[PDB]
Automatic annotation (TrEMBL):
This is DNA-directed RNA polymerase subunit beta. Belongs to the RNA polymerase beta chain family. The RNAP catalytic core consists of 2 alpha, 1 beta, 1 beta' and 1 omega subunit. When a sigma factor is associated with the core the holoenzyme is formed, which can initiate transcription. It comes from Mycobacterium tuberculosis. DNA-dependent RNA polymerase catalyzes the transcription of DNA into RNA using the four ribonucleoside triphosphates as substrates. Residues 1-49 form the RNA polymerase Rpb2 domain.
Length: 49
DNA sequence: CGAACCTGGTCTTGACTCCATTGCCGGATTTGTATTAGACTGGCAGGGTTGCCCCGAAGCGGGCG
């Protein structure tokens, strides 16, 4: 699970200081394409899936 | 009762040794400067991608003198 992991913060990706809370949220196009359960639990909720 | 003894510190003499310490002294290296003569004549360059708030500044529409 450290491979096959989707990340959302990099060069050209969204930094935490510019992170919008809309991108944190799941929405029903993740069904089958991402997992709403598994994500980091600290301040990086929803960015890393 | 008095006379020597050997030995502690306490100190002195003088000779010996040994090593710092400059002083050259000659050479090695190293730091800075100058000089290249055909002709050359205006840059690459991504972080920006928030949200909110306060505020300063431009700019134009609005009445105005």
């Amino acid at each position: 699970t450290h491979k096959r992991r989707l990340l959302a913060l990099g060069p050209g990706g969204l930094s935490r200081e510019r992170a919008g809370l809309e991108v944190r949220d799941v929405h029903p196009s993740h069904y089958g394409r991402m997992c709403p359960i598994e994500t980091p639990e600290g301040p990086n909720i929803g960015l890393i899936g």
